[PDB]
C-alpha cells in the first residue's frame, strides 16, 4: 500500500524522508537544497527551477506582447513560509491522487518503473549507478557525528516552477555524449525525471462554445483542478520512466474537425498524454514509427540485461534488479536463459503506457471537468490561494465538494458558482 509521507519544511534532516540533496544537474558542484520524500522514489524540492536559466529570466519581458498567458513573480517560493506552504499543498495533492484507485494505480506504476541502471553508452555487462541520470548525491548524518556525502537512486524529483509560474513541465536528465544531447528517457532505459510544478496557478476553459461572433462573454468558464494538472505531468513522467518520452514530432494529419479554440503544431507526447480524440490526431504512420522504435529499444535492452554480471555499487543485488527489469519491461526467458521480448506482452505494455493513463480519462474517474481538446486559446489563468482550506478543497473531492452541493455539474470548478475559490491574477 502506497504511503504519502507527512512533514513540515522546518523539520530537521533525518537521512530518510528529509535530506539535503545535490540535484542531478548540480552533480559535483556541491550545491544542496532541502528535499522531502513524498513517497518511495519521489522527492519534492521546494525551490524554483533555476536549472539552465539566469537570474534575470525570472523577471517579466520588455513590456510583453498582448498575450496575458505567461505570469511571472521572482519572489514566489523564496521564503521558508512559502516553501512549507508549497510542501503542504503537494502533500495534499498527492493524497487526493492516492485516494482514488485510478490515481493510486498511476502512482504505483510510476514508483515501480525504476530507471534502468545504464543506457546506450554504459558498460553493457554491468549495472551503472554512477550517473546523474539515475542518482543524486546527498549529505548524510552519521552516528559518529560526521557528515558525509552519499548517492541515492530515484524516479522523480519535483521542483517549484521556473521563470513562468503557470508552465508546468517535465524533462528527463540530459547526458552529454560525443558533443551531443542524449536522453535515456527516450531510449527505453528511462531516467530520473524532473518536474517544474506550481499548484497555485491553473488555466481556465469553456467547452460549451462555438465561435462567439458579435459577443464578448458567453459565460461558461471553469478553472482546472491542480491535482489533474499534476497527474497530467505525472503521465509525462510515466512515459519517461519507461524510456518512451516522445521526442519533438508532430505535423498536421487532419487538423480541422475539432471545435474549441484553434489549431497549431504541437508534440505527439502532449496529444498522447491528453488522450481522447486528440490522440487520433497522430497519424497511424507516426504511431507505427514510434511503436517500432520503442520495440527496438526494448529488444536492445533485453540483450543488455542478459549480459549483466556485475555492478559498481555493492549495495545492489544483481539478481534482484534483473527480476525488477524483467517485470518492468515485461521480458520473457528463452530456454537459453536469454531475455527476449514477447510481442503480445510488449503490445499490452506499450498500450498501457501510451493509452492507459490520460488527462481526459483521469478527469472522468475523478469527476473533474476537462476541456474538449488540448487545442485551446491562451485563456487568462486564475490563482487558487486557499488549497489548504478543506472548505475550499479537500483530498477526496477537490473543489467539487458534495456537502457544499458543488459535486453536480462540476460546480466547484465553475467560475460563476465557486467565486471565492479563485482570484484573478493582477
Ligand atoms: Zn472562450
Ligand atoms: Zn503536457
Curated annotation (Swiss-Prot):
Active site: 233
Binding-site list for Zn(2+): 232, 236
Signal peptide range in chain numbering: none
Protein name: Tetanus toxin light chain
Species of the source: Clostridium tetani (strain Massachusetts / E88)
Shown segment, full-protein numbering: 2 to 427 of 1315
Amino acid at each position: 500500500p502506497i504511503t504519502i509521507n507527512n512533514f513540515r519544511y522546518s523539520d530537521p534532516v533525518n537521512n530518510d524522508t528529509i535530506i539535503m540533496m545535490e540535484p542531478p544537474y548540480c552533480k559535483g558542484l556541491d550545491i544542496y537544497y532541502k528535499a522531502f520524500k513524498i513517497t518511495d522514489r519521489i522527492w519534492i524540492v521546494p525551490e524554483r527551477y533555476e536549472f539552465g536559466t539566469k537570474p534575470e529570466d525570472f523577471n517579466p519581458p520588455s513590456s510583453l506582447i498582448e498575450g496575458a498567458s505567461e505570469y511571472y513573480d521572482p519572489n514566489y517560493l523564496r521564503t521558508d513560509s512559502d516553501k512549507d506552504r508549497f510542501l503542504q499543498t503537494m502533500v495534499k495533492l498527492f493524497n487526493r491522487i492516492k485516494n482514488n484507485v485510478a490515481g493510486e494505480a498511476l502512482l504505483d506504476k510510476i514508483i515501480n518503473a525504476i530507471p534502468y541502471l545504464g543506457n546506450s553508452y554504459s558498460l553493457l555487462d554491468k549495472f551503472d549507478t554512477n550517473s546523474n541520470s539515475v542518482s543524486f548525491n546527498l549529505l548524510e548524518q552519521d552516528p559518529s557525528g560526521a557528515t558525509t556525502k552519499s548517492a541515492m537512486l530515484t524516479n522523480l524529483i519535483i521542483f517549484g516552477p521556473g521563470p513562468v509560474l503557470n508552465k508546468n513541465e517535465v524533462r528527463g536528465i540530459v547526458l552529454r555524449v560525443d558533443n551531443k544531447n542524449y536522453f535515456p528517457c527516450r531510449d527505453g532505459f528511462g531516467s530520473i525525471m524532473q518536474m517544474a510544478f506550481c499548484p497555485e496557478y491553473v488555466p481556465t476553459f469553456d467547452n460549451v462554445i462555438e465561435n462567439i461572433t458579435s459577443l464578448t462573454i458567453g459565460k461558461s468558464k471553469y478553472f482546472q483542478d491542480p491535482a489533474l494538472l499534476l497527474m497530467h505531468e505525472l503521465i509525462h513522467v510515466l512515459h519517461g520512466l519507461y524510456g518512451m518520452q516522445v521526442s519533438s514530432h508532430e505535423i498536421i494529419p487532419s487538423k480541422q474537425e475539432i471545435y474549441m479554440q484553434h489549431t497549431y503544431p504541437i508534440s505527439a507526447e502532449e496529444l498522447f498524454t491528453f488522450g481522447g480524440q486528440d490522440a487520433n490526431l497522430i497519424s497511424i504512420d507516426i504511431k507505427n514509427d514510434l511503436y517500432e522504435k520503442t520495440l527496438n529499444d526494448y529488444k536492445a535492452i533485453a540483450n543488455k540485461l542478459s549480459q549483466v554480471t556485475s555492478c559498481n555499487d555493492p549495495n545492489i543485488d544483481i539478481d534482484s534488479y534483473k527480476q525488477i527489469y524483467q517485470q518492468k519491461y515485461q521480458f520473457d526467458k528463452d530456454s537459453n536463459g536469454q531475455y527476449i521480448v514477447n510481442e503480445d506482452k510488449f503490445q499490452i505494455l506499450y498500450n498501457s503506457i501510451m493509452y492507459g493513463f490520460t488527462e481526459v480519462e483521469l478527469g472522468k474517474k475523478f469527476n473533474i471537468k476537462t476541456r474538449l481538446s488540448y487545442f485551446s486559446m491562451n485563456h487568462d489563468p486564475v490563482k487558487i490561494p486557499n488549497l489548504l482550506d478543506d472548505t475550499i478543497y479537500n483530498d477526496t473531492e477537490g473543489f467539487n465538494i458534495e456537502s457544499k452541493d458543488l459535486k453536480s455539474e462540476y460546480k466547484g470548478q465553475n467560475m460563476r458558482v465557486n467565486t471565492n475559490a479563485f482570484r484573478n491574477v493582477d
